A paper describes a structure:
We present several cryo-EM structures combined with functional assays, showing that human [name] recruits [name] to nicked DNA using two [name]-interacting motifs (PIPs) located at its disordered N-terminus (PIPN-term) and DNA binding domain (PIPDBD).
To test this possibility, we determined the cryo-EM structure of [name] reconstituted with [name], [name], and a nicked DNA substrate in the presence of ATP and Mg2+. [name] associates with [name] and DNA in a mode analogous to that observed in the absence of [name], but the [name]−DNA body is slightly rotated (~12°) to accommodate [name]. Compared to the DNA-bound form, [name] is rotated ~17° around its C-terminal hinge. The partial disorder of [name], the lack of a constitutive [name]−OBD interface (~500 Å2 of buried surface), and the mobility of the OBD relative to [name] shown by multi-body refinement, point to the absence of a direct interaction between [name] and [name] in the complex. In summary, the toolbelt structure represents a step of the Okazaki fragment processing reaction following the handover of the nicked DNA substrate from [name] to [name] to complete nick sealing, and agrees with the activity assays showing that binding of [name] to [name] through PIPDBD facilitates the seizing of nicked DNA by the ligase. Indeed, we show that [name] binding to an unoccupied [name] protomer of the [name]−DNA−[name] complex via [name] PIPDBD actively drives the transfer of DNA to the ligase active site.
Numbering used by the authors:
A (entry chain Y): 2 to 44, 60 to 97, 134 to 353
B (entry chain G): 1 to 185, 195 to 255
C (entry chain A): 262 to 901
D (entry chain F): 1 to 186, 190 to 255
E (entry chain B): 1 to 255
The structure:
DNA sequence: GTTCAGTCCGACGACGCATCAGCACAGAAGC
DNA sequence: GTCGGACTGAAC
DNA sequence: GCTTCTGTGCTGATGCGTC
């Protein structure tokens, strides 16, 4: 994920940072990036053990998960300088009644495309790439285990963009300059510079050309262009090409193989498939803004 | 400048006893029309509307609309003193951080006044549209309250069934299940049959307002927030809006 | 008139310069004036002088008021063997001040935080709450009676009863006694002087003016005509008599009455040591390594001992069959281990009547047959003496002998003591054993036994001489045994490098600056700082001043979201995390309060440092480069 | 299977409310003659015998004898939600897994029903022989409860005395001893009558009396029976329908 | 040697309960004239004085002047164990270590008895002079009780100010401020329900609401009470217990 | 004759059994 | 538990 | 049915005793 931009926001605009708790997100469809999620699940069935139990935990509090898998990754600076366990996760999605999407590229772009088009209200990832892809709401830290307390952090892209006044492209350029996975950035100018330089020079291209000293280490191959067009219009699937629906979960089909390929507590898994199934009797309660429009806010003098 | 006088002060006690609990901090909008207040609850699953028209005020003056944010637990503690039949009078200055209250006893003997501190509070407001409800039930609030309490004693999911032939309330808990019915002897008006489900984890908080009015009305339609409404004399009414349990 | 009462005047006369008549109960106002004169002085021997002046005055005018004014200076409420304690919190005191001064709690808390002292804010303020009768001036007997009443009054709504009594004492102040009452109730009297120094000022007073004189006192300066140096030589040999007399029997309730009615030279004739009274146990000195042990014990033939991580216990067996068990800090802990009291028929040989012994008690695994950590012992229950359902078993390790069959052995060589220990008890495997000791002067076996101990679940090494200085008497020197810690023996230990996140305001000597800190580890799989410990020790005065002067501008008014804290003390300031401080640790442990490292071994229980110590401000780093919770877990695994 | 109807639902309301703090679960035994429930407490120190005779109800239909294990706290949570004046009905099947409770209001605008989960339980059944207790006393219930509320306030044990014309309660503790004096009366709206054989004195736990005391609205008159060192019998006469009998161990 | 029977034990209940909250241990002096109870609080802020006279007792007989040290808690509970209408008879003889209470029921069939352990007690005696008071007010017991029960929620201390037009309470604190101006019940002399003020000079002072909440407990003995306020003087609150006695309280001001 | 050498005193820290306070509600009493 | 801190003694 | 409260735990918050 983009280096340090959470720090810039948490120092300049904590107001768009909303600490909230799990039961506040009832009914919500959530677009989960499968790649970073299975990556933390590996930290040999442990990747499946998190894939089972974290999915259960989400289902309990009205949250409907949308797992999005990666396609062709773009020309990473590190990566351009196996799917046995990946498809192992695709196996139990159908076997537990959860949908699987496959994105044309980095699934964080396809999760953000889904959010910005109304099909889903929140995502599930730790990386701010989805905010930079235009997702108005980011929901983070959900995928953590039950003991690691982690209340769930909202970010509001609309509020962030409004408070500084600096548009989406004037937020993509921030991310690139502040240190993306696509290229190095200018290690000679501090991370605090990003909001102020964007306020004074709302592009990376205008930002570099004004100051040309030997002390300003702009990238040796200056990929601060190409990432801007990538985050503007990434290689994503059509959201309405896949109407999300959450199916009846299997009561026995997973467990007949689950303890079989990886010997583990029968009682935990059988109770898990029961509890996730009973949570589907909930997921019911809704919210007034869906029925009645916001006339606006009324401000006291 | 705000000045309103009201001989029926005892209803304000009953109003603030109900509003306080679902909304700890709330904002009145004071207008030439009289006083109103709207706010949503914590989960954004319900909201309240208070309406009181200026027609019922013993004297009123207002040069412009005023927005006053107030903690309702403070007003409840204040009015836990004011006497059961007192005249209640409210006053405010053009830009003050305080609201004045003046209370006169019926016997003129015990005369009280207070001056509370305001706080700055801006809250979101939702503009409810006018609509007709496929079911309207009009019935005494005291039985409705008892039924809601009796059902959340067992289980939190309530089903409310409304039709020409009667009203039904169904629920169940880990101990088993129950059903209650009401017969036209309660009055029902309908256009289409409706049956919905809601959470008594808000209806037993709603039914606090039993002292505010002798009867309640329930307005319902398919996939629409239940409206529970209580009349306030001639001066106005109170409404609650609750999102359905899909 | 005590308002100008001046014990700083040269040549104090025990009766002529006092400010009450004899027979009267001692005015607490004078005790307060004298405490204000002591704190105004820095020189320790001048403080022992001024306290001796006042002890002499008391035994000249009002001998019965001796015992309370000791505790007015010693702050203790009785012999620790009784279990009496004041049992009042500093919050309760700050609310009592708010009631008696009429000031609201937020302002008084803010003032007390900026001054670091409840006694300073007890003055300069009034409630104007005029009673109808101006109160009776407190006596030192009355002050002590009200403090033991606060200790006695408990049960439901007890904090009301405590608040009432404390209000009453507070409104009865006249000029400056209130500050010292505020200190007195916290257990933090901050007098600048303690037990040994009060025993010294006592010894000087009781030697200058012995008991048994009728008024007016016939003799005032028992050192008269002698030169000050030979006076001092008589004072200090008498002071050593007193100290040894105090060491053989800890409680002033056995000492002070017989001191009045028999006089100071004949004290040991009555005061014999016996089973059923506890005795002051030996202390240990921190040494870094074996060359230091060899220079300290060059002439001294010495032996080696494991330092087991248990609780210190003294056992005192009477010939009638009742036997008691006592801690280091003097308390009666008997009935924590009633099963040991059930074991007494099998432990001693049939030829012996009674004894006193010292032992380290450690919890023992019945089927595993191994040691377990101090974190096992600390969770052991305390109040109930129920032996029917026993959860956690115990085994004993001997390390000294005090008393056998009617002979006192404290005065004797460790050679004859340990001989008589071995030759007069039976060992019971899994119940009670000698600590293993190896009897050599070769460094190899010593560093071998070091390794064997650190791998046999023990803390470090204990070193004892067999005869040279080996005796039990504390008064000659309290530290006759040596502790060889692993902590610096490795040259550098478990060093960690932690970011600053918060600061605590200073108090006492530390007041007017910062006085404590809160630190975080780095959690890179969240990009956030996990609070790991509070730091309060090992920084010097001028480097503390440098830490403050660097932190002054670094505050943030809000908590920045990059913090994780819970249950731990909410800090007085939030700090932007710009520097890292290298610190030292003695052990990792599973904190039920700290968030850091939760779930890497145990799900909810986080990790924190036993015995944290600051070391160095690591000025070159960036915050995220600091230690990770995964390394912290790795070290914890390496502890087993 | 059976079906039973009674117009005075309050009767069974109180019959339940008397037992709720004695035992949390019990076997109700229902047969064509009537309903019986014999059980010890949570501590073996006491026993209850509750009996309701079939002819005491307005309508009774039992064709198969049946005993159900019942969670009494559950049925308490049932009946708390109904008015006292309503008609009760209970139905049971042969496959004893759910009981139907029906509430018929005197204002017929409301009639309601609830289905409750049954449980399998085996109560340790015992035999209670009838015996001539050497002292027995009948008295009004309201003061007997007041006396218990008073004596349990000062201590945890009570001593009865039963003489030929005089009965007394006594309790002693830190703050003293309290003596309650009863003299026989022989007509008024209520009377205390003694059926003596030999004089006696016994001791009982005031705590279990503090629980027993909740049965007071079920009867005007309560009858207490004892001998030397046998348990105290306490009977509340439940109309012409039947009885509720406590049996409480005497403290040595 | 002492014996004292009184028909309306309800007064005795009410007064013991009303005293409990402020003091736990106190002494009666009993004499052939009657009973007195003077006591001080542990803060020595609030002084109480009860007086009973023999003509208020139905059957009173004291021969020797006897002091009874009594813990209020045990005897208050003993009268909680008694009916209101029951006829109560205190009994003891010379150097009796135990206090006898007889409780008599209107049914003749119930005649209960309770023995209380006495205890040693020494109390300080103080001699407050009777004097003029600058302001005197008679108020219904309920109206002052309600004023205080209310104002306990607005602050911790009340700034009283009496005057010829009407008595003012006023206070301030955490949530705001609150004023109560009781006027004088002037045009209609209802007696049972009136507020009456007499004043030579106005007086204005500050007082503690904790102790006012402790004082108001004697409201069920009389429908009215009287307040005497004077500059720098402890507030006198008085409860005239019909023709059996008087109960008086002094409150140290917060000047 | 002063840079060492040792005492002694209180700065501060981490856990955990006990043990009481502070809502919070059924409950009963009071009416 | 533990480390620093001010001062009299250590004794050369 | 309403009143304020009482008796009811349950959970939270420190004081003080190990080291
Ligand atoms: O001064 P410290 O607290 O570091 O050390 C004294 C402490 O050590 C423990 N101890 C373990 N084993 C011991 C021993 N003390 C004496 N002898 C042996 N053999 C004990 O807890 C002491 O209090």
């Amino acid at each position: 994920g983009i280096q340090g931009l959470a720090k810039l926001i948490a120092d300049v605009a904590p107001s768009a940072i909303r600490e909230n708790d799990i039961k506040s997100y009832f009914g919500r469809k959530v677009a989960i990036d499968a790649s970073m999620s299975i990556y933390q699940f590996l930290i040999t069935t442990s990747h499946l053990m998190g894939m089972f139990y974290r999915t259960i935990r989400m289902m309990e509090n009205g949250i409907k998960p949308v797992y999005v898998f990666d396609g062709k990754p773009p020309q990473l600076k590190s990566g351009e300088l196996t799917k046995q366990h990946n498809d192992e996760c695709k196996h139990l999605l159908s076997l537990m009644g959860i949908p699987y999407l496959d994105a044309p590229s980095e699934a964080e772009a396809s999760c953000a495309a889904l959010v910005k088009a109304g099909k889903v209200y929140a995502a599930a990832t730790e990386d701010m790439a989805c905010l930079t892809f235009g997702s108005p709401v980011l929901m983070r830290h959900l995928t953590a285990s039950e003991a690691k307390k982690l209340p769930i952090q909202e970010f509001h892209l609309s509020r962030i963009l409004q408070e500084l006044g600096l548009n989406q492209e004037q937020f993509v350029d921030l991310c690139i300059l502040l240190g993306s996975d696509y290229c190095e950035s200018i290690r000679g100018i501090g991370p605090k510079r990003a909001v102020d330089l964007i306020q004074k020079h709302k592009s990376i291209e205008e930002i570099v050309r004004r100051l040309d000293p030997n002390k300003y280490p702009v990238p040796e191959n200056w990929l601060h262009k190409e990432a801007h067009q990538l985050f503007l219009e990434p290689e994503v699937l059509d959201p309405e090409s896949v109407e999300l629906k959450w199916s009846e979960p299997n009561e026995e089909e997973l467990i007949k193989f689950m303890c079989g390929e990886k010997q583990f507590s029968e009682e935990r898994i059988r109770s898990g498939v029961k509890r996730l199934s009973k949570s589907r009797q909930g997921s019911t309660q809704g919210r007034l803004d869906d029925f009645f429009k916001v006339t606006g806010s009324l401000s006291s003098a | 400048m705000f000045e309103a006088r009201l001989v029926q002060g005892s209803i304000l006690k009953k109003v603030l006893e109900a509003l306080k609990d679902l909304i700890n901090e709330a904002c009145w909008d004071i207008s030439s029309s009289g006083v109103n207040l709207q706010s949503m609850d914590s989960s954004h699953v319900s909201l309240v509307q208070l309406t009181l028209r200026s027609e019922g005020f013993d004297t009123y003056r207002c040069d412009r609309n005023l927005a006053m944010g107030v903690n309702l637990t403070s007003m409840s503690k204040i009015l836990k003193c004011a006497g059961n039949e007192d005249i209640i009078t409210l006053r405010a200055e053009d830009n003050a951080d305080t609201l004045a209250l003046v209370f006169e006893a019926p016997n003129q003997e015990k005369v009280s006044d207070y001056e509370m501190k305001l706080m700055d509070l801006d809250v979101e407001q939702l503009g409810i549209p006018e609509q007709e409800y496929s079911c309207v039930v009009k019935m005494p609030s005291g039985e409705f309250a008892r039924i809601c309490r009796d059902l959340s004693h067992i289980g939190d999911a309530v089903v409310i069934s409304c039709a020409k032939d009667g009203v039904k309330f169904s629920a169940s808990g880990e101990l088993g299940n129950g059903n209650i019915k009401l017969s036209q002897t309660v009055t029902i008006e309908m256009n289409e049959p409706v049956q919905l489900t809601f959470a008594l984890r808000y209806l037993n908080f709603f039914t606090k307002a039993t002292p505010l009015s002798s009867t309640v009305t329930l307005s319902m339609s398919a996939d629409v927030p239940l409206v529970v409404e209580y009349k306030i004399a001639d001066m106005g009414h109170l409404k609650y809006y609750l999102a359905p349990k899909i | 008139d005590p308002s100008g009462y001046n014990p700083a005047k040269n040549n104090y006369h025990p009766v002529e310069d006092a400010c009450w008549k004899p027979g009267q109960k001692v005015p607490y106002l004078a005790v307060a004036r004298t405490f204000e004169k002591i704190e105004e002085v820095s020189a320790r021997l001048r403080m022992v002088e001024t306290l001796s002046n006042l002890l002499r005055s008391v035994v000249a005018l009002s001998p019965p008021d001796l015992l309370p004014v000791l505790y007015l200076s010693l702050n203790h409420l009785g012999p620790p063997q009784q279990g009496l304690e004041l049992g009042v919190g500093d919050g309760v005191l700050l609310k009592a001040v708010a009631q008696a001064t009429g000031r609201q709690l937020e302002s008084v808390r803010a003032e007390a935080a900026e001054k670091g002292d409840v006694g300073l804010v007890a003055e300069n303020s009034r409630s104007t709450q005029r009673l109808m009768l101006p109160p009776p001036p407190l006596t030192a007997s009355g002050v002590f009676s009200k403090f033991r009443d606060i200790a006695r009054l408990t049960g439901s709504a007890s904090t009301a009863k405590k608040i009432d009594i404390i209000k009453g004492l507070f409104v009865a102040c006249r000029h400056s006694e209130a500050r010292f009452i505020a200190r007195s109730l916290s257990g933090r009297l901050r007098l600048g002087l303690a037990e040994q120094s009060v025993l010294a000022a006592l010894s000087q007073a009781v030697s200058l003016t012995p008991p048994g004189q009728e008024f007016p006192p016939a003799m005032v300066d028992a050192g008269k005509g002698k030169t000050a140096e030979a006076r001092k030589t008589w004072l200090e040999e008498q002071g050593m008599i007193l100290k040894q007399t105090f060491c053989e029997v800890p409680d002033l309730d056995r000492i002070i009455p017989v001191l009045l009615e028999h006089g100071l030279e004949r004290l040991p004739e009555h005061c014999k040591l016996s089973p059923g009274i506890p005795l002051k146990p030996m202390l240990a000195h921190p040494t870094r390594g074996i060359s230091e042990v060899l220079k300290r014990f060059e002439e001294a033939a010495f032996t080696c001992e494991y330092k087991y991580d248990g609780q210190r216990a003294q056992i005192h067996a009477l010939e009638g069959g009742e036997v008691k068990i006592f801690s280091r800090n003097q308390e009666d802990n008997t009935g924590k281990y009633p099963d040991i009291i059930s074991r007494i028929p099998k432990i001693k040989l049939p030829s012996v009547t009674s004894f006193i012994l010292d032992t380290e008690a450690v919890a023992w695994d019945r089927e595993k047959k191994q040691i377990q950590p101090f974190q096992v012992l600390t969770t052991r229950k305390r109040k109930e003496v129920d032996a029917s359902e026993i959860q956690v078993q115990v085994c004993l390790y001997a390390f000294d002998l005090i008393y056998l069959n009617g002979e006192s052995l404290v005065r004797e060589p460790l050679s004859r003591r340990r001989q008589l220990l071995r030759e007069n008890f039976v060992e019971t495997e899994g119940e009670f054993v000698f600590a293993t000791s190896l009897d050599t002067k070769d460094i190899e076996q010593i560093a071998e036994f070091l390794e064997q101990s650190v791998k046999d679940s023990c803390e470090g090494l204990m070193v004892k001489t067999l005869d040279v200085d080996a005796t039990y008497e504390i008064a000659k020197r309290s530290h006759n045994w040596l502790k060889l810690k692993k902590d610096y023996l490795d040259g550098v230990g478990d060093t960690l490098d932690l970011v600053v996140i918060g600061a605590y305001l200073g108090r006492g000597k530390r007041a007017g600056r910062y006085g404590g800190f809160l630190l975080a580890s780095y959690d890179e799989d969240s990009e956030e700082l996990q609070a790991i410990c509070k730091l309060g020790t090992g920084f010097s005065d001028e480097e503390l001043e440098e830490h403050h002067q660097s932190l002054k501008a670094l505050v943030l008014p809000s908590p920045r979201p990059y913090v994780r804290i819970d249950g731990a003390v909410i800090p007085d300031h939030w700090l932007d995390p710009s520097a890292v401080w290298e610190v030292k640790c003695a052990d990792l442990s599973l904190s039920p309060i700290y968030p850091a490292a939760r779930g890497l071994v145990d799900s909810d229980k986080g990790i924190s440092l036993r015995f944290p110590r600051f070391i160095r401000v690591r000025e070159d780093k960036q915050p995220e480069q600091a230690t990770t919770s995964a390394q912290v877990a790795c070290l914890y695994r390496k502890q087993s």
